[PDB]
């Protein structure tokens with residue numbers, strides 16, 4: 001899966017449909033993987049560099065693959 | 070969903086009915102989303118700015134949408 | 139539910155019956171709510187002020203309601 | 208249940224059989240309680256004093272009771 | 277089980293198939309044990325020394341045994 005965005009988590013959002021949204025770089029992306037919620041918030045708090053891989057590389061795009069650096 | 074309150078988490082409360090209450094700004098709001106419990110406490114501890122979106126914007130109102138920044 | 143004790147967590151204990159014990163003030167109280175385990179340990183570690191509400195306000199008393207400050 | 212060991216967590220180990228091993232003092236002990244895994248690692252990271260209670264007080268002994276100070 | 281790699285976590289990756297990949301030393305290894313996800317990210321954030329034991333000691337190899345120091 002190709003890299004979509006790389007950078008620090010600007011903000012996260014818990015959605016009504018139990019999905020989780022992350023804003024990295026110029027894109028806002030969501031994931032339906034519950035396990036990623038605490039991981040992503042931890043990355044945001046500690047200022048980790050995140051790389052999100054997805055074919056749906058556009059605002060509102062879904063993803064499941066994330067690299068934590 | 071419209072913004073209800075924005076600010077830092079004053080306090081949180083675990084309720085008997087397994088719901089979670091948060092005090093942000095001048096409102097005390099609850100959520101039945103179990104996944105939000107650890108996320109909200111983490112935000113409280115680290116002093117993150119939280120934005121709660123809900124149509125039930127009043128004390129005792131329920132919510133599911135939260136922005137972490 | 140009335141306030142039982144308020145103060146910092148002196149110590150926590152995982153019990154054989156999968157319950158969680160907390161020592162706040164002069165009371166040792168337990169909870170059968172699994173979700174409260176990580177939350178309480180986090181409060182202990184970060185030195186948060188905790189308020190436990192319960193009608194069984196005595197050593198060995200059970201609780202489910204907790205306020206995190 | 209009698210005290211077995213008291214001290215700081217030297218190291219932890221996730222085992223193939225989904226159990227969790229902790230080295231405290233001169234003993235290496237394991238627990239089959241999944242909820243204890245994150246709690247124990249947190250205690251290790253923050254340098255908390257841990258007290259493990261078990262009748263199987265010997266290397267390779269199992270436990271379920273832990274006191275966090 | 278023999279030691280494969282020892283060192284600090286270079287990076288972690290959540291995969292599409294719900295597995296978790298870790299890069300330690302010169303190897304990139306994965307695990308299908310969900311409980312290890314938060315533990316490994318915590319070790320990465322706090323800079324812990326990790327030792328991964330596996331017979332599949334090669335890039336793309338699977339593991340379940342990890343020592344946290």
Ligand SMILES: OC[C@H]1O[C@H](O[C@@H]2[C@H](O)[C@@H](O)[C@H](O[C@H]3[C@H](O)[C@@H](O)[C@H](O)O[C@@H]3CO)O[C@@H]2CO)[C@H](O)[C@@H](O)[C@H]1O
Pocket residue numbers: 001030031032033053054055056057061062063064292
């Ligand atoms: O968490 C949401 C979702 O993330 C991953 O899927 C993403 C999109 O949700 C999904 O629509 C997208 O589909 C791709 C096909 O995989 C690809 O073969 C085709 O060429 O393009 C479409 C749309 O661009 O895939 C992305 C992931 O790259 C995850 O796979 C999915 O299970 C779910 O978790």
Ligand SMILES: OC[C@H]1O[C@H](O[C@@H]2[C@H](O)[C@@H](O)[C@H](O[C@H]3[C@H](O)[C@@H](O)[C@H](O)O[C@@H]3CO)O[C@@H]2CO)[C@H](O)[C@@H](O)[C@H]1O
Pocket residue numbers: 016070099100101102122123124125130131132133
């Ligand atoms: O966590 C509890 C609850 O949060 C969310 O619902 C909130 C209130 O609990 C709910 O009563 C409220 O419903 C609104 C509708 O959104 C609105 O369209 C209609 O006109 O009036 C009712 C009554 O105010 O909605 C808020 C959230 O905006 C969440 O949606 C719900 O599933 C549940 O988790």
Ligand SMILES: OC[C@H]1O[C@H](O[C@@H]2[C@H](O)[C@@H](O)[C@H](O[C@H]3[C@H](O)[C@@H](O)[C@H](O)O[C@@H]3CO)O[C@@H]2CO)[C@H](O)[C@@H](O)[C@H]1O
Pocket residue numbers: 085139168169170171191192193194199200201202
């Ligand atoms: O975690 C265990 C338990 O916590 C809460 O219950 C507490 C005690 O365990 C329970 O014995 C106690 O019962 C009360 C009644 O609620 C009250 O109506 C009556 O007058 O007195 C008895 C004896 O004190 O209630 C406390 C809670 O205040 C929680 O409610 C329960 O579900 C369970 O999780």
Ligand SMILES: OC[C@H]1O[C@H](O[C@@H]2[C@H](O)[C@@H](O)[C@H](O[C@H]3[C@H](O)[C@@H](O)[C@H](O)O[C@@H]3CO)O[C@@H]2CO)[C@H](O)[C@@H](O)[C@H]1O
Pocket residue numbers: 154208237238239240260261262263264268269270271
């Ligand atoms: O996590 C593993 C396991 O921990 C606890 O059990 C421990 C040993 O695994 C168990 O063999 C041991 O049994 C004791 C009897 O309880 C005691 O009555 C008798 O005198 O001696 C035997 C052997 O020493 O007990 C320890 C706990 O003290 C936990 O109880 C168990 O459910 C499980 O989680």
Ligand SMILES: OC[C@H]1O[C@H](O[C@@H]2[C@H](O)[C@@H](O)[C@H](O[C@H]3[C@H](O)[C@@H](O)[C@H](O)O[C@@H]3CO)O[C@@H]2CO)[C@H](O)[C@@H](O)[C@H]1O
Pocket residue numbers: 223277306307308309329330331332337338339340
């Ligand atoms: O998390 C994935 C996986 O990790 C552990 O298994 C690893 C490999 O996935 C598995 O193929 C490998 O199997 C070995 C046998 O242990 C060995 O006895 C035999 O001779 O060769 C095969 C092929 O290398 O073992 C490693 C771990 O050592 C874990 O055991 C497994 O349940 C699963 O979680």
